[PDB]
Design a protein around this nucleic acid. Sequence first.
RNA 1: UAACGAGAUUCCCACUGUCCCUAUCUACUAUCUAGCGAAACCACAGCCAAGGGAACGGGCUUGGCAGAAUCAGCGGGGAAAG
RNA 2: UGCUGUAAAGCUGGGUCGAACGGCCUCUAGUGCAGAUCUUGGUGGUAGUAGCAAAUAUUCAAAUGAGAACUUUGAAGACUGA
RNA 3: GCGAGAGACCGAUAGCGAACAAGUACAGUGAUGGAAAGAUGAAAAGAACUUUGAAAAGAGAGUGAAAAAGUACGUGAAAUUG
Lengths: 109, 63, 386, 172
Amino acid sequence: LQDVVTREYTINLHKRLHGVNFKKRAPKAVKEIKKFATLHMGTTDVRLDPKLNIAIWKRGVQGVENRMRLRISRKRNDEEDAKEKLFAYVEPVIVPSTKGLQTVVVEDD
Amino acid sequence: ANLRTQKRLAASVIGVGKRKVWLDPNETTEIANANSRSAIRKLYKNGTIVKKPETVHSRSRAR
Amino acid sequence: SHRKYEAPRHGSLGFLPRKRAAKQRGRVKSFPKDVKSKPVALTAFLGYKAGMTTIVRDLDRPGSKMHKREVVEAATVVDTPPMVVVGVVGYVETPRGLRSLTTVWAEHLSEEVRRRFYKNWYKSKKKAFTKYSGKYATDAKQVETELARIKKYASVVRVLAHTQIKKTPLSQKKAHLAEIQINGGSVSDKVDWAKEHFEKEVSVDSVFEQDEMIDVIAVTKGHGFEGVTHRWGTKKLPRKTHRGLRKVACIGAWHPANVNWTVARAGQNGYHHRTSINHKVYRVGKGTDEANGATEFDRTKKTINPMGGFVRYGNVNNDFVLLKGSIPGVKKRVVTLRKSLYVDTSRRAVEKVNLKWIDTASRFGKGRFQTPAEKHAFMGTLKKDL
Amino acid sequence: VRYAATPANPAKSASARGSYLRVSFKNTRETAQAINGWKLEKAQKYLDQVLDHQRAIPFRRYNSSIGRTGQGKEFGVTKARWPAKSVNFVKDLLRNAQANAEAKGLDSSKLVISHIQVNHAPKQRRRTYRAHGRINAYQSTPSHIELTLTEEQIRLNSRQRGRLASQKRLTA
RNA sequence: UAACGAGAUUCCCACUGUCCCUAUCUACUAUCUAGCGAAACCACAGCCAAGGGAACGGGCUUGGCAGAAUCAGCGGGGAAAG
RNA sequence: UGCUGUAAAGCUGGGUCGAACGGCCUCUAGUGCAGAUCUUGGUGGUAGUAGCAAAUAUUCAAAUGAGAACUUUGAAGACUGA
RNA sequence: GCGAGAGACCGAUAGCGAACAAGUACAGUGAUGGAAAGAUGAAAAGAACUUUGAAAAGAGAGUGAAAAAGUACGUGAAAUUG
Ligand SMILES: [Mg+2]
Ligand SMILES: [Mg+2]
Ligand SMILES: [Mg+2]
Ligand SMILES: [Mg+2]
Ligand SMILES: [Mg+2]
Ligand SMILES: [Mg+2]
Ligand SMILES: [Mg+2]
Ligand SMILES: [Mg+2]
Ligand SMILES: [Mg+2]
Ligand SMILES: [Mg+2]
Ligand SMILES: [Mg+2]
Ligand SMILES: [Mg+2]
Ligand SMILES: [Mg+2]
Ligand SMILES: [Mg+2]
Ligand SMILES: [Mg+2]
Ligand SMILES: [Mg+2]
Ligand SMILES: [Mg+2]
Ligand SMILES: [Mg+2]
Ligand SMILES: [Mg+2]
Ligand SMILES: [Mg+2]
Ligand SMILES: [Mg+2]
Ligand SMILES: [Mg+2]
Ligand SMILES: [Mg+2]
Ligand SMILES: [Mg+2]
Ligand SMILES: [Mg+2]
Ligand SMILES: [Mg+2]
Ligand SMILES: [Mg+2]
Ligand SMILES: [Mg+2]
Ligand SMILES: [Mg+2]
Ligand SMILES: [Mg+2]
Ligand SMILES: [Mg+2]
Ligand SMILES: [Mg+2]
Ligand SMILES: [Mg+2]
Ligand SMILES: [Mg+2]
Ligand SMILES: [Mg+2]
Ligand SMILES: [Mg+2]
Ligand SMILES: [Mg+2]
Ligand SMILES: [Mg+2]
Ligand SMILES: [Mg+2]
């Protein structure tokens, strides 16, 4: 077990947004990504890089991409009182295509 | 912490709408002290306050 | 005043209350009446509704305009792996009804049936039936004493059997355990049969033959809260009716100054217990047969499964029962197959079914191929095939 | 000021008050009754879980036409809620009374909520506007809250005596 | 009586869920939660059947019966409210 | 807390309280309330209920602050569309 | 109107509408209409100080004959409520 870890994930935002109100698709992709980071990093404190918000909203309120390649970092919370010992930082990964990509551990170097 | 007056002053000093005024997010303390139009001019000249570029309406397809 | 015009009542008063079933496993309300002269045999079986298919069949019904002519018929596939016998119950005739006297269990119960007795299996010490398993210590005379009590006092003997749900594609790990009455022979014969079958598998081919008429016990599809228009099939009110039209306009006369139980009201629709009778067995398939879906006229080596699997079920890799028509329940439902309660000698009941062909095209769309080999032969090489 | 209930041993008790609190009286009565008689530390942990929706406040009297939940099964009810404004006001008073107990030298791990009650405070009036030019009341129902933390012959007849005496002589 | 008419009426073509006979889909409600929070109405109240009775009872008489606390709906009754 | 009277009522124990008040013989009257869709004031049940649903739509981060769905700034997504 | 003395008068829902910054606040285009609202304590002696809290406040303490008098102030009924 290492508490500080960075991994790259593909999130299938298409199935998570299925049937969703068209004026809530980009707002809900924010919530789905936060819930995605809690699933993998185990932390309810999830922070989204503003570059990720720009990528989500790039095509308007319902133009969310089917798949996004995300980099999620678990980092130590130094605040006091944090009420959450760790936190997850989510930021986008620019790739040519978001298909065929598996989960990869990123060794920060 | 409340730069509402400075943005209104900057629009009048620069001569653009408030939609075109950029207040440096990293200079909140310096802008908050800019209580006068004279101080707004200095920050505009220093680049602390920037006039944002006009949004392009190209006539190429119309042409 | 009377109705201006007559009309039949909407819906049946014999299926009230239209409430949810108390359990999802349909329960056999009545078993076939016991005849001593018959051999000792089971009267029911548990299976899982896989999906529906289509067959082609030559009709044998003299005097019909379809006689000796091919008919296309809907059929239901019930995935039925063998059930395991784990117990036996004795019932006593009393002036207040049948009363269970004793339940004798097998020494070893598999984990899938011991999960039946738990709400939180993963948090448990899994202590169920451990002391009972100790009751078999080196002489097992307690078990023999209870079995002798059943032989001495019971008039109705039922076996306890559970499904092997691990052989199905379902993610549920709890087996379904049910009492299946034993008919035929004396009570002693039934008890001996039950004891000798402890921890043994019993297949469908030992309970149901082809061309049999069987009954289906299941809980139907749930629809939740429903209005009167679809719950009871009442007439929609005119388009210009204030406050809405999917209603019953008059829910009662002034007197009785109460709403009657016979008036259609909004409420929960579906998820009801139903007993559906006279379903003909077109096929008792075998899980080991690699040509499950093949017939004597369609020699394509072919399982019963459609292309891409049964939608929202999976593949039927077990023994199965192919029933004519539709049965109550949804896909993955546990289904109770019961033997008929009477002797039907009509031509529909005694006709011998010989299948011509079974549809195995995809149910996930307008499938137009029966086999991947047929698909490749029709289309030739694709880019992904190189 | 006079509390509704005086502690049996005032040296082992601490009290807190909140008056004219603009919190729902009906919600506050239910949350106060939910921790009446509890250990102070147990009630504080419990109120945190209510704010997090891991556990609920059972609504027992003021519960007409409110929702049902599975988090009420813990208390044998179906109607329970999570009144956050009431929980925060009550947590503030438990915190205050615990500070009062610490200044007295009492032990927090031994403290018990021996008394808690909610009274009506005077209403705060507003106005709501109705169809056909009408005015109606839009009042608040505020609360008074108070709580206390407490540290943890036979005379016989002549013939009754006569029967009793003669029975002794039988037993030697 | 040509023309005109958000005037009244009959027939015909076109058209269609008006209908046979209904089904499905979307948004907002309703629903559940946090916060906020009215009003109408209120003798006391609130299960039925028959009787008699101001001649159509929730209460009386005689029977049927009758088991905490409740949620969403509903429009038979309260000879419901205004 | 009790006692007395058929009764209207009178007297009394305990608690609370803080400046006046009673018995008897008479006089006098703006002299006794359950009702008047009574008057004025106050308070309930309803009820944590109806509801807070028109005007396309918000989101990420930082700052401030005890506390930020709602403040400020930045980034974006939108709209009014002369 | 001015100046006095009185009463088997009323005692803050009474007595003038008004015991009080009352013909005031407030309404109405206007003529006009027109309230509610007295009482800590002998004396502010109107609670210094410590502590918890962002604060309001609370808990100790203090003043007082009394805080069962803390300006949301004499007494403090009923409805209604914990
Ligand atoms: Mg949908
Ligand atoms: Mg529906
Ligand atoms: Mg209409
Ligand atoms: Mg109808
Ligand atoms: Mg299909
Ligand atoms: Mg209640
Ligand atoms: Mg409701
Ligand atoms: Mg409800
Ligand atoms: Mg004419
Ligand atoms: Mg015309
Ligand atoms: Mg005209
Ligand atoms: Mg409703
Ligand atoms: Mg009569
Ligand atoms: Mg009746
Ligand atoms: Mg009545
Ligand atoms: Mg009776
Ligand atoms: Mg009605
Ligand atoms: Mg209705
Ligand atoms: Mg006294
Ligand atoms: Mg006295
Ligand atoms: Mg005095
Ligand atoms: Mg006198
Ligand atoms: Mg009078
Ligand atoms: Mg009165
Ligand atoms: Mg009144
Ligand atoms: Mg009220
Ligand atoms: Mg509501
Ligand atoms: Mg509305
Ligand atoms: Mg902004
Ligand atoms: Mg536009
Ligand atoms: Mg005078
Ligand atoms: Mg007056
Ligand atoms: Mg007056
Ligand atoms: Mg007073
Ligand atoms: Mg402090
Ligand atoms: Mg006193
Ligand atoms: Mg006093
Ligand atoms: Mg007082
Ligand atoms: Mg009282």
